[PDB]
Amino acid sequence: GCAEGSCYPATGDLLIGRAQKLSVTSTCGLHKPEPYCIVSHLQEDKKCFICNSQDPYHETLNPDSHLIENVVTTFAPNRLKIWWQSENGVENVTIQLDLEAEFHFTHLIMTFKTFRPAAMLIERSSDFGKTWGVYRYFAYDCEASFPGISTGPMKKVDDIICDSRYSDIEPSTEGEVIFRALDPAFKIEDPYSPRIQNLLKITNLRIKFVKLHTLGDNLLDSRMEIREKYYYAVYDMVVRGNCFCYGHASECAPVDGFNEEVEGMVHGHCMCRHNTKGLNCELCMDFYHDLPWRPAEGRNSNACKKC
């Protein structure tokens, strides 16, 4: 009953259709390819190989590409051999998500390759980079990486804390990092207020790397010949979110001017129903300005009345 009540848009993956909108200051396979490998390689008879990320990934022709824009979810059974590989001895690595409009973000899962980064944090941008918020802190040692941040159980729903639950030292078997913007149980109710909405709507998600785990062999030298043992790499990152429509429609039509005849993308344009207008349906449409705009919750349509 979308017309009679309220239906919320379906939540889907963001990377589908947004793979080309990835940026990072850390990519191997430059104009001069160089080897990159880590200790304890088991399934591969050869110790390691040469990173070659000058071409988009291919199953056979280019099986060593590591561009950030080619990594996707487990679309194909070849997920085990697609990822991005960082450089040697990098401590300030940063990736971000580019969005056409404001989306809803709740959680992201990234399956790392070798080691969960020692320091992990998420940077928030709800105004296209004008401001810079933060979600949470992940650190192997909270005080060493992010001093002055509380560690332990939950304190507040919207409080930044540091947790070591996702910076372990045994992630080799495709270990991932769990993050949830909204706690499964610590959430008392759904205010649907600007206090939580502005702290959930995202224009440009930002992920930053501050530290990388060291096994101790590279702390005794500062040479480029051994820094290749340590590097960041993610098998696949998945971001789930939905087009923000204030609970009017259960789906969003494809963005005009886009010719992607594929099933799976998540857009950001909501068709307007219950006598409203706007790109995200933020104002009542013509002849229905009698009542002020109100959100739709539950079965309450809260449609604007005729003038």
């Binding site: 304890s40 030292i169 045994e170 702390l219 005794l220």
Partner: protein, 305 residues
């Protein structure tokens, strides 16, 4: 000055085993809590261990520990005897290295609960590096060492700690152990001279003494009759290691560029470059009596002038 290139010390070194299954005829090992993979139709959930057979998968010797790309040796099933809890693995590097870290991962068994990481230089005396126990309580009761709290950290450069965080049974399959010797030390950035001999050894002994248990053996035990045990309830307990990869630097005070193998002496030794002297780059050539010989540092090569 300039340390030699990193090389996996375990790949080119010899490894000795105290005891492995298959050397006493056929042997029957059942996975701890799970069934055999279904390649052989097998209701009796034990793959047959062996030491002299035509099937490579049947044989599980220590010659598949490190040199094997992805294989393993398992400790003999305790049905042969209760004494098989104490099994020692020796890493014969044939030369004294500067060990920085060690990596141990199991294949088809939980990571061992009680096991010591003993170093060796002369080949006779052995000094442990870290202590491991099934629980933090076991560290005080058995080894009389206070276990570390929270993340494993070192309160002193030469301190020895008993860590139980790597003995958890949760990684039942392919459990991993990552031990560090420099990270977290007060002199982490600058290797202290006392830390040099602490992290330097020629033989590393992987002495295993207790297997992680799900209380299967404790349910049926016979103190009076130590030579009569139920084979089925004990066949599920045994050690298993599939990779003992280790890395480190050649001990010549970082006055080289690499450590190529030498055909003349069948030994791995760094070159004596950067105006150094001696057979092992541990002295200065005659004519520099004004400055006594002393090892270099990371910042500078510290030429023998």
């Amino acid at each position: 000055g300039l340390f030699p290139a990193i090389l996996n010390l375990a790949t080119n070194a010899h490894i000795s085993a105290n005891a492995t299954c298959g050397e006493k005829g056929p042997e029957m090992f059942c996975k701890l809590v799970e069934h055999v993979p279904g390649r052989p139709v097998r209701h009796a959930q034990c793959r047959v261990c062996d030491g002299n057979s035509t099937n490579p998968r049947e044989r599980h010797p220590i010659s598949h520990a490190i040199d094997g790309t992805n294989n393993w040796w398992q400790s003999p099933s305790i049905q042969n005897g209760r004494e098989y809890h104490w099994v020692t693995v020796t890493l014969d590097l044939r030369q004294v290295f500067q060990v920085a870290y060690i990596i141990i991962k199991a294949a088809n068994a939980p990571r061992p609960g009680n096991w010591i990481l003993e170093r060796s230089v002369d080949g006779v005396k052995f000094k442990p590096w870290q202590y491991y126990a099934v629980s933090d309580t076991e560290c005080l009761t058995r080894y009389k060492i206070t276990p570390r709290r929270g993340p494993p950290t070192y309160r002193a450069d030469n301190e020895v700690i008993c860590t139980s965080y790597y003995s958890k049974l949760v990684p039942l399959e392919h459990g991993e152990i990552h031990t560090s010797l420099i990270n977290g030390r007060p002199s982490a950035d600058d290797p202290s001279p006392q830390l040099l001999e602490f992290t330097s050894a020629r033989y590393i002994r992987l002495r295993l003494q207790r297997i992680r248990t799900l209380n299967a053996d404790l349910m049926t035990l016979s103190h009076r009759d130590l030579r009569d045990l139920d084979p089925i309830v004990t066949r599920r307990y045994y050690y298993s290691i599939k990779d003992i990869s280790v890395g480190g630097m050649c001990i010549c005070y970082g006055h080289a560029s690499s450590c190529p193998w030498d055909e003349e002496a069948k030994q791995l030794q760094c070159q004596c470059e950067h105006n150094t002297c001696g057979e092992s780059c541990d002295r200065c050539c005659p004519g520099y009596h004004q400055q006594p010989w002393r090892p270099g540092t990371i910042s500078s090569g510290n030429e023998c002038e």
